[PDB]
């Protein structure tokens, strides 16, 4: 939870006292390229 | 029977006999584009 008036935050159970970091998230999308078929001379075949 | 594939279509028009034309040359092109990356497609329209 986060108190709307004082901005105090309560963590999940069983965390001991100590030092911690606080920040924000981000995504790391990636997308390969589809394979291809290539004969001896390097020509592309079988696209369909 | 055998099969095959034309290497490419990105060298524009030519007028030599077929024995000597380089790879990629074609016989007739009109209102087309020799665009790379997108292929051999039609040209856009002219805006007033």
How far does A43 lie from chain B, in Å, by closest CA?
7
What's the DSSP call for residue A9?
B
Residue B24 near residue B8, CB atoms below 8 Å = yes
What's the CA gap between B33 and A4, in Å, rounded? Answer: 61
Q: What residues pair up with A44 in beta bridges, in sequence order?
A: A38
- Chain A CB within 8 Å of residue B5 CB: yes
What's the CA gap between A6 and A3, in Å, rounded? Answer: 6
- Chain A CB within 8 Å of residue B39 CB: no
Q: What residues pair up with A38 in beta bridges, in sequence order?
A: A44
What's the CA gap between B5 and B44, in Å, rounded? Answer: 28
Residue B40 near residue B10, CB atoms below 8 Å = yes
Residue B25 near residue B3, CB atoms below 8 Å = no
DSSP per position, B1-48: --------S-S-B--S-TTTPPTT-BS---SB---TTT-S-B--PPP-
> Each residue of B15-32: b (16+ CB within 10 Å) or e?
eeeeeeeeeebbeeeeee
Technique behind this structure? cryo-EM
Residue B17 near residue B39, CB atoms below 8 Å = no
- Chain A CB within 8 Å of residue B7 CB: yes
What's the CA gap between B41 and B43, in Å, rounded? Answer: 7
| Final resolution, Å | 3.2
Residue A1: alpha-carbon gap to chain centroid: 24
């Amino acid at each position: 939870s986060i108190d709307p008036t004082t901005y105090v935050v309560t963590t999940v159970r069983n965390v001991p006292d100590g030092e911690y970091f606080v920040g924000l998230r981000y995504t790391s999308v990636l997308s390969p390229t589809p394979p291809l078929v290539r004969d001896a001379n390097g020509i592309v075949i079988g696209t369909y | 029977a055998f099969d095959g594939s034309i290497k490419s279509l990105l060298q524009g028009v030519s007028q030599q006999v077929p024995r000597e034309r380089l790879d990629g040359q074609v016989s007739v092109q009109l209102n087309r584009l020799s665009d790379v990356v997108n292929g051999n497609r039609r040209r856009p329209g002219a805006r007033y």
